[PDB]
Amino acid sequence: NPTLPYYQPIPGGLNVGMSVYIQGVASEHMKRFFVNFVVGQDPGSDVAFHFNPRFDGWDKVVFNTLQGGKWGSEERKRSMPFKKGAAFELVFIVLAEHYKVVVNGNPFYEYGHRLPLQMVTHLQVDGDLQLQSINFIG
Ligand SMILES: OC[C@H]1O[C@@H](O[C@H]2[C@H](O)[C@@H](O)[C@H](O)O[C@@H]2CO)[C@H](O)[C@@H](O)[C@H]1O
Ligand SMILES: [Ca+2]
């Protein structure tokens, strides 16, 4: 099983039609975790899409982009699709318009592209979860 933090090159880079399958388990003691779609592996690399479930405060998920080391306008959904201790299936479908986020078969969010998606080279995952597998399809 992959170890954390996980920071992996996406084969051939990100492209439309690709789906990222993440199987994991949310920690019994989960505060946060994130999945980042990252542009390169340099100090201060841009993050085209930051997906950040949070139990601090109102349980929620935060979505954003980091460009030039600055966070953009945050998007939020005040709903939590994960559960402490519970296994989950997290899927990112890459479409021309947005990343479509699906959690346990349910559509959860559509994040509109801010950085051109072909810039993304790496998937990065860290925080309060256990990773079982990550597969790239398409
Ligand atoms: O937006 C993603 C980014 O959020 C940072 O925290 C934000 C916080 O969500 C917001 O409510 C507050 O106004 O500004 C904070 C600083 O930008 C996190 O620090 C970072 O890890 C990302 O998750
Ligand atoms: Ca809470």
Numbering used by the authors: 14 to 151
Paper text:
The galectin-4N-lactose complex structure was determined at 1.90 Å resolution from crystals grown in a PEG-based condition that is different to the other crystals reported here (which were crystallised in high concentration of sodium formate). The binding sites of all 4 monomers within the asymmetric unit contained unambiguous density for the lactose molecule. The binding interactions observed between galectin-4N and lactose are the same as the conserved interactions observed in previously reported galectin-lactose complex structures. The C4′ hydroxyl of the galactose saccharide interacts with His63, Asn65 and Arg67. The C3 hydroxyl of the glucose residue is in interaction distance of Arg67, Glu87 and Arg89. The presence of galectin-4N Arg89 which can form transient interactions with the lactose C2 and C3 hydroxyls could contribute to the slightly higher affinity, as the galectin-4C equivalent at this position is Lys261, which does not form similar interactions.
The tandem-repeat galectins, of which galectin-4 is a member, contain two distinct CRDs at their N- and C-termini, connected by a variable-length linker region that is susceptible to proteolytic degradation. The overall fold of human galectin-4N is the conserved galectin β-sandwich fold comprising two β-sheets, F1–F5 and S1–S6, of which the concave side of the β-sandwich (S1–S6) contains the saccharide-binding site. As with other galectin CRDs, the amino acids forming the binding sub-sites C and D are conserved, while those that construct the A, B and E sub-sites are slightly different, granting galectin-4N its unique binding specificity. To investigate the interaction between human galectin-4N and its natural saccharide ligands, we have determined the crystal structures of human galectin-4N in complex with glycerol (the cryoprotectant), lactose, lactose-3′-sulfate (3′SuL), and 2′-fucosyllactose (2′FL) at 1.70–2.00 Å resolution.
